[PDB]
């Protein structure tokens, strides 16, 4: 299983198309203050991987968390992650929807910031890694075996929507 403690991510927005699918993190146990769901775990660490179609007894868009390109002036969804121990991070696998006909496309680029201590600022040197198939592909993001305890991954926008369903990590606990 993913040895993650908590993750910070903006609140899931709603796509109002035909019947209006809700793309919110319904299983988020943490508290959502302002425009951030910080200090908790939800749909991005539940083991359940999203289906090829986000619409498919629950409301349409239950197994997904979304964000629109127009609602982010920065152009990226700043997602933070907190871990229990100082681990060496090999790679991050995220299952995103690639439905081009409804705007939900894979991110154009993902850069991550690393830090070992909770009080110190992000070390630096981000690991940035960069279509017709409309199937949900598990995006492989190489983290270069860097030893860190907290992450700050920014998911760039390529399509009008970014629909993540599950975020997994590959790491070994360093002594």
């Amino acid at each position, epitope marked *: 299983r993913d040895g993650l403690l908590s993750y910070t991510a*903006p609140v899931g927005q709603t796509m109002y198309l035909s019947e209006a699918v809700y793309l919110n993190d319904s299983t988020y146990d943490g508290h959502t203050v302002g425009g951030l769901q910080y200090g908790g775990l939800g749909q991005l660490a539940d083991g359940v991987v999203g289906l090829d179609d986000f619409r498919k007894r629950v409301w349409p868009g239950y197994d997904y968390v979304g964000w*629109s390109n127009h*609602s982010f002036s920065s152009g990226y969804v700043e997602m933070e992650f907190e871990f229990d121990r100082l681990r060496a991070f090999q790679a991050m696998q995220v299952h995103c929807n690639n439905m081009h006909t409804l705007g939900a496309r894979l991110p154009g680029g993902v850069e991550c910031r690393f830090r070992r201590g909770p009080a110190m600022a992000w070390e630096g040197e981000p690991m940035r890694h960069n279509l017709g198939d409309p199937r949900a592909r598990a995006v492989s993001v190489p983290l270069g075996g860097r030893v860190a305890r907290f992450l700050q991954c920014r998911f760039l926008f390529a399509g009008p929507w970014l629909l993540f369903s599950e975020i997994s990590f590959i790491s070994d606990v360093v002594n």
Partner: antibody
Amino acid sequence: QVQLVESGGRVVQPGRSLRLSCTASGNRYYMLWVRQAPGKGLEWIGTISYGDTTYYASWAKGRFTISRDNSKNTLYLQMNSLRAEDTAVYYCARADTGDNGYLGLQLWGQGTLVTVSS
Amino acid sequence: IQMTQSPSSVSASVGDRVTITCQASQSIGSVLAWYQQKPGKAPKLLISGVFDLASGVPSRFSGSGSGTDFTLTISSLQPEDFATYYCQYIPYGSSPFGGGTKVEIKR
């Protein structure tokens, strides 16, 4: 009970620099500044993404710096160069998401009238 | 970048259905806000997103639109509804404001 009271309300001379202070009683949200000239409508001035600023405005490209102080829990707005046409009531917005995830400020400030004349 | 609200004023009596249009300079997303502002007072949030309403705000305030064309229909105009309205596209960052449709009572 959450409040947003700004310590402004000062008359300044054309060219002078006045700084406003949006103190927040009851704190770290996506903060904005919106002005309203007497008779005129509302025009958004700028925004700050938790300690890291985000583009102010097409007109406010020059001057208008939005500083933030977590130790004093107050937003600071330095206007630097000023013209007589910049007289308006200055409010500080607090953007909070609704039940659908989308943003929209729910709590507004009190407003402080700034007059720019010689 | 530019939010062009139209018209600048609406003359209607208590009970009339009133729709306010908000035009966007670019084909923006569904995010939008509607503010009620009575004279000498601070603004009040009525709508978040497009269709979502704020707490306290009655159900007569209906939202609609997507892209550039946006609307604000009112089920039944009430004496406490007369105020200037402002549409505002508000993402996490750069959020410009609208013109201002001043709702006026008809007598």
